[PDB]
């Protein structure tokens, strides 16, 4: 954090992309509920036996 | 006021109502009869002998 760079180099600052999520005109209905596992952004969620928001996974017993 | 992430819709809050009270008054009727037996004998501030 302390010393500066005297050398010569390249670098990127980043690369933006859009993230388009909607594709139609249905109503958009939400409610918040309590989770029960780790959940990312825009992950498909299910509900376990207690009502917690477990992320979606088929092939379960 | 509730905290809402700025994508989702929102929250709805309930309200309250009324109450009533009614009353009716009560009725009071005292009275006296007056005989000649109460008028005649001597009221105290009166001189002796002749009233």
Residues of A in contact with B9 (CB under 8 A): 28-30
A9 Cα to chain B: minimum distance (Å): 41
Resolved by: cryo-EM
* Among candidate residues B12, B2, B13, B8, the one with its CA nearest the CA of residue A32: B8
Q: In units of Å, what resolution does this entry have?
A: 3.8
CA B32 to chain centre: 26
Residues of chain B that touch chain A, judged by Cβ-Cβ distance less than 8 Å: 7-9
B7 chain-A contacts, CB cut-off 8 A: 30
Which residues, 6 or more positions from A56, have their beta carbon under 8 angstroms from its beta carbon?
A43, A44, A45, A46
Number of Cβ atoms within 10 Å of the Cβ of A36:
16
């Amino acid at each position: 954090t302390s010393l500066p760079n005297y050398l010569a180099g390249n670098g990127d600052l980043g690369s933006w992309e859009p993230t388009q999520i909607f594709a139609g005109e249905a109503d958009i209905v939400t409610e918040g509920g309590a989770a029960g596992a780790d959940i990312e952004i825009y992950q498909v969620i299910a509900k376990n036996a207690a009502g917690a928001m477990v992320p979606h996974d088929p092939t379960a017993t | 006021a509730p905290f809402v992430a700025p994508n989702v819709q929102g929250r709805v809050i309930k309200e309250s109502g009324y109450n009533t009270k009614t009353f009716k008054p009560a009725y009071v009727k005292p009275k006296h009869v007056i005989d000649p037996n109460m008028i005649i004998p001597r009221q105290p501030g009166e001189a002796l002998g002749t009233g």
